[PDB]
């Protein structure tokens, strides 16, 4: 895969940014952020606001100042009642996720604002979503 | 952009007064 299958000309821009950041730096983060923007919509599955709040805040709850980063859509979970002070950076946020983070929490970022906050992608988590539909 | 059975079989709503003067005409 060498060019996104889409025609979203606000996503030729991101690829024009992270395929510059892939080759002028030594991070395999940018060679993993770029290696996901090419993937089709069924290959970038959604991930909820509860699985993100569960991934960072568990075991020792190491959630100090790391920005969760998913190249997908940050959807919502409403069975989660209280939302922790999180910070995410995805392409799309659903309008019930972006209003359930800001209501008590931190920052919602596009991968633009990520590249001006962690240009080499340090102090981050690079999560995915579950690809498993269990039959489809 | 715009900004209990005894009292119902006997009492009626009011005359519903008239606005814009043509339903008052």
């Amino acid at each position: 895969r060498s060019k996104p299958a889409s025609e979203n000309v606000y996503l030729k821009l991101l690829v024009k940014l992270y395929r510059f950041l892939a080759r002028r730096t030594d991070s395999r983060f940018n060679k993993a952020i770029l290696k996901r923007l090419f993937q089709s919509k069924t290959n970038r599955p959604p991930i909820s606001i509860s699985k993100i709040a569960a991934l960072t805040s568990r075991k020792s709850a190491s959630s100090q100042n790391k920005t969760t980063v998913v190249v997908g859509t940050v959807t919502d979970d409403e069975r989660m009642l209280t939302v922790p002070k999180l910070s995410i950076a995805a392409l799309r946020f659903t309008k019930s996720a972006r209003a359930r983070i800001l209501k008590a929490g931190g920052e919602v970022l596009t991968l633009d604002q990520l590249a001006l906050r962690a240009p080499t992608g340090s102090n981050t988590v690079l999560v995915r979503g579950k690809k498993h539909a269990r039959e489809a | 952009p715009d900004p209990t059975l005894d009292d119902v079989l006997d009492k009626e709503i009011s005359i519903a007064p008239a606005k814009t003067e043509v339903v008052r005409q």
Binding site: E78, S96, R98, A99, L102, K103 | -
Partner: protein
């Protein structure tokens, strides 16, 4: 033996009884959480208004 032959349909009719108010409560708790999820005002965009 369980229930009579024709009276088993109650369990097939019963789901329908919920199915109107299934979507009806989920059309109102949806909006209730869509009422309380209003983003704050940020009195910075209003100065030019």
């Amino acid at each position: 033996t369980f229930v009579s032959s024709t009276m088993v349909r109650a369990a097939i009719r019963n789901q329908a009884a919920q199915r109107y108010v299934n979507r009806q409560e989920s059309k109102l708790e949806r909006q209730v959480r869509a009422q309380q999820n209003v983003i704050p005002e940020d009195p910075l965009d209003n100065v030019f208004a």
